[model samples]
Structures are given as structure tokens and as C-alpha cells.
Target: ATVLLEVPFSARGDRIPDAVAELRTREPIRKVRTITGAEAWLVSSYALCTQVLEDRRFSMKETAAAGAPRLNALTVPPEVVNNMGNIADAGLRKAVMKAITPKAPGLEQFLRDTANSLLDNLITEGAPADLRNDFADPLATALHCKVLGIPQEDGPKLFRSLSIAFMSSADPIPAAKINWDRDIEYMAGILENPNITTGLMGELSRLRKDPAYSHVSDELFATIGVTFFGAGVISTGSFLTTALISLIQRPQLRNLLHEKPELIPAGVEELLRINLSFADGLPRLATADIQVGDVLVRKGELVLVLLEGANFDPEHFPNPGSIELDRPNPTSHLAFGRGQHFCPGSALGRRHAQIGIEALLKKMPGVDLAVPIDQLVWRTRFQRRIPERLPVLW
Candidate 1:
């Protein structure tokens, strides 16, 4: 069953509602096999999804361990996994937390300024435009570069390289690997530069030099920088575009959000839950037998918690198909994973969304989809979900 499911590697956006409905009522917890011949559990219930996300019993690191269940033959190697989860150490996590904590005010201002400036440019360019390209993409990339202390002038070049390396699907493996290596090497060079002393990289360099925290390596700091830059540039841009499309399709909801700008924060949360921007949950492997909602997941089994299904379970979210901006306990949504693995960038992501949405509504009040909704293109690979292009006009 799981293997068959992988045949349709990508699910149609229209089918999501029905899938959520069925999962909530009939198969909240079900077994499925993947194309790679691995058995896994799909937990769809909201409660179970939350439980699985919070439970330390399921190990994300186990997928790298010997004899562990494999989610896919393409699963990233252990070294990459370790580098990706860069702040695994307690002290490093604290240092990052401290650095980012004071930046909330600055972040908010940067998002607002960046969004409004982009909106101004869009207005100057006149009406019909690809929002994905003109507004969302540049704004995200620029903000990411700014926050990371990358020179604004060099942002376009870096964005082009990283975007192509990460976003291209047709590129051969060797080509992709070369581009990937180049991105890392470029980032490392920037971090090591003695003249660059403004953004996150400057802070990281200072931390790296501190004798008390000598454990923080240059590679680790560079990894963190690259991860933030890539995610902020790509995921944030994609999600913002998704949110806009969802709003354009439902005018009543759009008007409501426009009327109550305070609700923008809540709207962003609902949008993340409702869209499930990432196709599936982060992969994990069971280290021991675990029972979730009557299903026994054996040790060494891979488990995929469908985030969209979980968020829309009728049992947890009544009238799940409908958008309820004021839904009580909205924070309970697993858009960000639970527990220690929760996304450290969630706050910044939300602020970016809020600023982008608010600026769009205020500056381009007449903005509407210039093409049929069905004509929009969606990108799919391993981690991110987003419209290939969002065509809009005033």
C-alpha cells in the first residue's frame, strides 16, 4: 500500500481535502509502504500527530543509524544530517537564541521596510506582474541576505546560484553536487572574510573566536548561515505566495483579513496549517515499538506524519475544510514541529509573512489573480512546496 502511494509521489492540491476527510474519519492511523520497500505508519489525527512530534521515542537521528528503517533511498547521509541540524549542542543553541532574541525588533522593521520597498517597486512597474518573482522572491532573498549580513549588492548573485542549485530538478546528480558544493564554499569564503562584520556572520565569527566557546567550528557556523539563507530565501517566499493564492481564491476571507489586520498573525498560522506547505512531516524512525492510536509501529519502522491531514482532522479542527482565522488554540497546529526540534525560525517566518501580507493588502488593494487558479504551477521535490509562479494584476 505504501509503495503504491509513492507511485503518485505528488498529490493533487484538489485531492487534499478529501484525503484529510478520509484520514480523519476512517484511517487516522494506517500502514503504508513506500516505493523503497520500507514499511511506515501515517498518523493523521491531530492529537496523534502532535504526540508523535513531541515524543522523543521516535528518533530523527535513527534514520542515519545502522540497520535503521529507510524512508527513501535518497535519504540524506549522516554527515549532512548532522550539519543540517547544526545547533544540536546546548551551548550553541543558547548562543543562537541569544543572538536572535534581540533581533526581533530589528527583524520586524527589516521585514516591513523590505516589503514596502518591494511593493513600491511593483507599483512603479505598473499592474500585471508575477508576484512570485517581483514581490515575494526578491523580498525574501533580500531580507535573508540582510539578516545574514551578506552584502545587498551580492544578494542577486548568491540567490541565483543557491536557487538554481537547490530548485532545479532536471540537473544531473554530478552537476547538482557541484553546484551544492559551490554554494557551501561560497558561503564559507564569505564567513571567513575579515572585512565582513555586520550581520549574523559577524556575530558567528566573534563567537567562534571566543576562547570559552571554542567548540563552535567555522563549518558549523557556516552551515547555520547557509541553512538560514536558503530557508529564508526559499521556504518563506514560497509560503507567502501560497498564502496569497489561498486568499485570492476566497475573496470573502481576503476582505476579512484586510479589515482586521491584527488577525494577520493568526491568518498566517491558519494558512500554514491549511496549506501544509511542506508535503509531509520531517522523517523519523522508531527506535522502539510504539503504539499510536491503535497501530503498533515496530522498532526500525519509518513513520511519516502527514502534517496537512493532521492539521485538518475534523475531530481536532471542526469544519476542518473551512478557514477559521479565529480558531481557538491555533498555536497547537504542528506547522512547526513540536518539542526540541521546533523550528527556531518560526517567529521570524511569521513576522515575514505578516509584513508581506499586510503590505500587499495595503499597497495593492486591487491585486487579484490574473490567470485562472488552476493554471498556477506548483513545485515539488523533497522539502519545500510552492507555486512555481504567481501571476497577479491590479
Candidate 2:
């Protein structure tokens, strides 16, 4: 099959459903060459996706290793690779999971209150607001800061620098390197401070002191901080803005959600599945010669799992294109990923998105687009997909 050049890399995942639907019905897996000129297998089946994700035969760490399949020039080093896997390690995974698990009964209420307070600021002045700037962006940064023990004031500064470093296409490596160095230094400084001992960092500090976990390094702590900030901020912010746009475009659905707040969790999952916000899934390398559906992947070849494809597979999700508010088995979707490398902050992400949407719906029932949908510019050339600005009115 000829690759479609007109399909922008930023929006490639958005087209996965149509492509995967064709593949799943006609061809289970296909040998496709990426725009980068790399030979790879594109997996489309739900079962195969789960198998690949869980199988140790596919190595996420190898993609970052020396002489691994080069998808694009990577800025990350091997230590960073080890740090990422370590975060997924059983003990370390438990420590971080303990900090973020929504089991603390009062935490959701605290977050809901925090979300409402932020929304009040957005609507305080008046109508015509850029939700991206006034509401979504700030709320996400604040929530992340609250979780990480970083002061609210410093988040904007760090976010601005880090956003540019990660989102810019023009040699973002140097900017990323500088930001990483600064972040490690900042985390070191925070660890030394006595006043900040309540959030993820505080818990990490406590975990580090235990004799069984003495090997946990400051770099590992720094990795967690950076990962939390990277994953939690802009993506959730994008979800907030996009979900609002989706509601405004489909008012009845918004009304449905508002009428049934219990449906919000499923609504969030459906939104994430259908929104196509993430540009692409993480790259994994073949640890040995393996077959993905019908395609044989040679040892060390890189595979980019099309998230939109897996989430929208018709066999797995009935009426996959249409949003079903009461869709069960959403746990089967790979929106936050699966297996050992699954996203640690999924519960937190869900709460942030759910509360943010609930706040907007309650505060501004009449919210609608200020400009035509096609006129709204989408952010390009970034790992995370998002609207450049979402202009709206209440």
C-alpha cells in the first residue's frame, strides 16, 4: 500500500480508524514503510495489540538503546531509558501508585473544589474567553504543581520552557537537555527544603529513606517529576479544551452528561478514545524475530502502535466511530496504554478531565464556539496533539 504523504504526521493517528477498519476486515497486519523510510509492521487487531504490549519479546527500552532502530533522532539518553523502566518496576511502581491512587476519599472532593475555583477565575471577568489560555492551560499546570509539590508560581516558568523544548521541531534536543538539567537541580533543591513535604516528591523522599529502597537516586526522582509534568500538564489541558469543543459541537451529548453525572467516567473514556489527542503511541523494538498478526517483524525493528486503531477497532468496540455514553469494557482500550508500561497517572488524568469538564458544564451551560470549527488552528509538529487556541463564548 502506498503511504499517503498528504496526511500530516501530527494527524496520522486520527486516520487510523479508517485505515485499521480496512485492515482488520481485509488484512490483519500490513507491511508498511514509514515516512522515515523504516520498514515496520502496523498491528490493527485488539488481541494482537494486547499481546504485543504485554510480551517481553517486544522491548520498549531497546528503542532508546545504542544501535536500535532509529525512528527519528532521539534526545533521550540510556540512563533516562533505565529511569523510565525503573519507574515501571514493581516496587517503584507501587510507591508512586500509592501516592496517586484516588483511594484517599477526600482527595476527589479537594480536586473538584480546586477545579471549580479555577473555573471561577476564567468566568469572573466575562464572556469571550480563550479557554486554552484562561481555563485549560492554567488549571492543568496548577493541578500538576499541586501533585508534585512545586509552587504554583514556578510552574508557568517551567512549563513555558519545557513546552518549547518538547514541542518545538527545530532542534528541541538542546532546549530539552537544558530543561532536564534545570529540573534535576530544582528537584535537588526541593528535596533539601523542609517546608515542602506533602505531595509526590515528599512521598518519594520518604520512600527513599527506607533501607529496602536506598538505591532510588535523585535522577530517578527527577525522572518522575519530569514525566509527571510532561504527561499531566498539556495532555489533560488539551483534553479539557477538546472535550469542551466536542460538547459545544454536540449540545445534546453535553446535556446528557450534565443530567447524568455518574456517566462522566465513561464519557471521559469515550472522549479519550474518540478525540485523537495524542499524536502517536510510544515506539517499541523487537527483541527477537516476531510475527504481528500477518506481518513478520525482524529482530530490532521498531513498531509504532497506532493508538487510535486499537481504541477504535470495530471488533473490540461496537459502533467504534460513534460515541456511546454507556459503553462498557472501556478498560480494553489502549488510550492510557496497557501492561507493565501502562500510564501510572491514568486515574489522576481521568479525575482532572472529569472535574474540568464538570466545572465547565455547570458554570457555562451556554458555552459554544466563537469561531467556526475549521477556522480553529490545531497545534502541529509536537509529540502531544492540541488546538493552538480554542476561542469560545458563554
Q: Can you list the residue pairs that collide in candidate 1?
A: 2-32, 2-33, 3-33
Work out the TM-score per prediction.
Answer: 0.90, 0.90
Candidate 1's residue-wise lDDT over 247-321, tens digit each?
A: 777788778878888888888888877775665556778878988888888888888877786778777878776
Evaluate all candidate structures by whole-model CA lDDT and list the values in order.
0.71, 0.72
Q: Evaluate residue 1 in candidate 2 and report its C-alpha lDDT on the 0 to 100 scale.
A: 90
Position 248, candidate 2: lDDT: 79
Worst 10 residues of 1 by lDDT: 164-173
lDDT of 2 by residue, 1-394 (tens): 9553222245422233355578667765555655445556666667777878888778777877776654454545566655547776626777677776655456677677877886687688776788888888888888877787778898887677545544524232676777767877787777667777777878777776778777767677767777777667877887777777767777888888888878888888888887677665456789888877767788888776767668777888988877787677876689888886787778888888888888888888788899877777777666666677778888
Root mean square deviation (Cα) for candidate 1:
2.9
- Compared with the true structure, model 2 gives a TM-score of 0.90
Which residue pairs overlap in candidate 2's backbone? Answer: none
Reference-based lDDT, residue 336, model 1: 73
Off by over 4 Å in 1: 1-3, 7-17, 35-37, 66-68, 73-77, 83-86, 101-105, 161-172
